[PDB]
Design a protein around this ligand. Structure first.
Ligand SMILES: [Ca+2]
Length: 354
């Protein structure tokens, strides 16, 4: 699997991506060209990459749990806004990069990165817990307001500046090392059996190459968005292409002005003569997606209270909202078969990089 392949994404958003409350993506990758803003209970389980090339990624509320297996690229700023101690956030990420806007890890949360690189200030505050498993290279690390940052054994943090304040704590484990060019501890602690080194002329290692690779990739250049097709069969706003040679059946639904659940029931049944609960669904829309009555879709699971979409969602508008009434989404990534890829490649005039 490749981070520059459109068909690797569970969510590919050309513009922004504002999911509904209670949204789980399981597998695949997540891309947005502009802002990502999640309004609570957002979960990424087994996500390979999360690439955001816009100005913010704002994770709001509690109960968020994000797992990144490879690269989390944050073009400018990432902000976990704050979780109740009764519904804390978790982040487990392999490699994280942020640009100049930083990474604000507000608290009631356990945030782990194995590698962290940042052209800005990593803040850990308001009881947040941040652990670096192997390496860190950041402009600034500041722990305040009862935060905690642990350098785990074997790891090395490099930061140009280190600020600890208002009962912030930095723990350096045995065999770990923190290396800063300047330091300012007023009100906070640094303990632990590892080495802490102040060196105004320290030489840091180089960023790994994936950072520039992604910064340098013009995602938009790979496609030419024109109009999304529509047929009068079924919902007159939507178009679709389907594949019954696959198991389960696969259908991609195109909606130039958005998609809703009434239209989806109409369109799918017209093409398939039914709407089996196991259908693999690929939604491609230039407006929002709205499920006003999700229990009407056979994808709704009454036991979990979730719409279970197996497939992927491609959104092409500048702004994009998923809205749903009285249910959560469980989007399980499933790579499309070739009939569906050919339809999407044709529709978006897509040229895969390799
Ligand atoms: Ca139609």
């Amino acid at each position: 699997s490749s981070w520059n392949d459109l068909f690797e994404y569970a969510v590919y958003s050309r513009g922004s991506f504002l999911p509904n409350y209670k949204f789980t993506v399981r597998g695949g990758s997540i891309y947005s060209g502009e802002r990502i803003q999640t309004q609570g209970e957002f979960k990424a389980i087994g996500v390979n990459n999360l690439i955001c090339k816009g100005p913010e990624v704002i994770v709001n509320g509690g109960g968020n749990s994000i797992e990144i297996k490879e690269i989390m690229y944050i073009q400018n700023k990432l902000v976990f806004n704050g979780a109740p101690n009764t519904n804390p956030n978790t982040l487990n990420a392999n490699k994280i990069y942020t640009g100049l806007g930083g990474m604000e890890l507000n608290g009631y949360g356990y945030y782990k990165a194995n590698e962290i690189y940042s052209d800005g200030e990593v803040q850990v505050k308001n009881y947040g817990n941040f652990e670096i498993g192997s390496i860190g290279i950041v402009k600034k690390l500041t722990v305040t307001d009862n935060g905690r940052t642990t350098i785990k054994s074997g790891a090395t943090l490099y930061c140009d500046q280190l600020e600890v304040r208002n009962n912030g704590r930095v723990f350096i484990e045995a065999g770990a090392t923190l290396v800063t060019r300047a330091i300012s501890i007023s009100g906070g602690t640094i303990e632990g059996p590892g080495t802490r080194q102040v060196n105004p002329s320290a030489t840091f290692p180089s960023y790994p190459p994936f950072i520039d690779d992604i910064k340098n990739f013009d995602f938009d250049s790979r496609m030419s968005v024109t109009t999304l097709p529509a047929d009068p069969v079924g919902a007159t706003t939507l178009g679709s292409v389907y594949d019954k040679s696959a198991t389960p059946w696969e259908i991609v639904v195109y909606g130039e002005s958005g998609i809703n659940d009434s239209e989806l029931i109409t369109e799918v049944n017209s093409k398939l003569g039914s709407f089996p609960s196991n259908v693999r669904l690929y939604l491609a829309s230039k407006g929002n997606i709205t499920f006003s009555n999700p229990t009407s879709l056979p994808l709704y699971n009454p036991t979990t209270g979730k719409l279970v979409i197996e497939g992927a969602i491609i959104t092409l508008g500048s702004t994009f909202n998923i809205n749903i009434s009285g249910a959560g989404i469980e989007l399980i990534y499933k790579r499309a078969g070739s009939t569906i890829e050919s339809s999407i490649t044709s529709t978006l005039n897509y040229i895969p990089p390799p």
